Design a protein around this ligand. Sequence first.
Ligand code: CA
Ligand code: CA
Ligand code: CA
Length: 581
Amino acid sequence: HKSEIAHRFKDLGEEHFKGLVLIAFSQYLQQCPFDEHVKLVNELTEFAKTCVADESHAGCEKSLHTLFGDELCKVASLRETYGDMADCCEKQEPERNECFLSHKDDSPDLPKLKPDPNTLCDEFKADEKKFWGKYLYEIARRHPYFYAPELLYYANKYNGVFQECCQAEDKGACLLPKIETMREKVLTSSARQRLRCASIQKFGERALKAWSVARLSQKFPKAEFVEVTKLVTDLTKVHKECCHGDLLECADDRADLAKYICDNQDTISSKLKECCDKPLLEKSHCIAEVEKDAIPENLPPLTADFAEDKDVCKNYQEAKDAFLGSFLYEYSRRHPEYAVSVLLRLAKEYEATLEECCAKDDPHACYSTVFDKLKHLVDEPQNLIKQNCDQFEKLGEYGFQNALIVRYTRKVPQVSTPTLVEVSRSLGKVGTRCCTKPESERMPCTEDYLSLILNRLCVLHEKTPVSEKVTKCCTESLVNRRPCFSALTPDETYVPKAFDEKLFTFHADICTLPDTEKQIKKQTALVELLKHKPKATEEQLKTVMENFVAFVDKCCAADDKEACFAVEGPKLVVSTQTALA
Ligand SMILES: [Ca+2]
Ligand SMILES: [Ca+2]
Ligand SMILES: [Ca+2]
């Protein structure tokens, strides 16, 4: 319009407008309390109404970044709570937002929420809109890049669970499974978008486009490349907007994209009917997770247009990015079975083949044989999966994570321990989420998740950079990250950490911790073990681990548990030291 804030309020409605802003403030200022953020939301919302009534009013012409940003700077506690973030205020837009974004904490160390059915069901009956708002808040301050519109959708879902389950006889039995299920979908989502924002920030839009072209051509093989391109442009803008903190424009731009998809479903896909009858937030989610359409019946083989054809360099030279998109599009729509990362490497390889072969005397002789060279890039992944799935089948989740701890602590011992523990834990879960699946689906499953988790490792590592190898693997290429990490081996350069008793002492507090935090503490100890005794043998750790559990199980049952750990602890230390020589 004439007034960006006005347009947003009109298109989105007050409800979603307030949600999205609550989120914005929650992701930028992750340590502020909910009550204060609600005040800020209402203020901005009142201003928004003024501008809708009167697009000419003072300030209404300013971008959301300017307006929202002018609000952060008016926060009295800003420097007290966030230090150098206050300095962002001394700057102009766009640098001011670039600055604010750069202080978003990807690991806030906020307390793990332990949901209590009573208190939650009380809060819900008491005030449903506020309940919803606090959920938006608690997730947004922990996931500062969470896809804002999807977060609205989850908040709705969350609420629907409470509406249903607080009526029931056993509140807890009804809802606890339901929020544990949803909570896993949310954590995945978080990661999925964090990889989107990391891509654009570290490798440019171009990298995100390529991802999308792959993803959508798989989903919509029936669509002409013209359409997929419009879809990708629109979907990329949506993400760029969310990633830069313009949540209202992200929300609006996404709803527009869903309307367009439903209006043209005849030239996009036959599997959208049920999606396109749903309410606004639910409609977009449904599209994003839609079933892949069938592949057109008689398609020409790839070799025809990308290897046997005699004008390939000519066409490539004259539209490099379109031609590579085209390839990706055509290859992608033929292979829904493939992982999006594999598809992208094939594109990256194919690209490298063209760049090299097109400078030679006889380009065709060179590029003719390219799909034999790509066949290899599909087989390489299939080895790891099989081996790692066997290792998973053998050990089960927990034991499997402990192998990964060992492998990765040897690979990258400089990395912080909490990072190693979190990442190895998530890497292990991949066994549960994938190996159980139909043998053929295994690699695509694991390749996608690994992509998500390895991204988390890079983002955590990028802040306190301490390992040249992680840095090399994280920054060299987005597509080859998984292979880069796989290929790392332990480094004999690494001087082992000096012994530190405090790392191996366990306190009676341990028996109070829930299973997950129990394993964390043990898995923390394991990491520290390999940092200090990095050449320690698989067989030796069996007994050391065996003896930690024998020790832990030995004291949590004892008459005076405090008295137990006092004497028995030092036993472990002395024992383990001797064992590891
Ligand atoms: Ca932290
Ligand atoms: Ca904007
Ligand atoms: Ca619109």
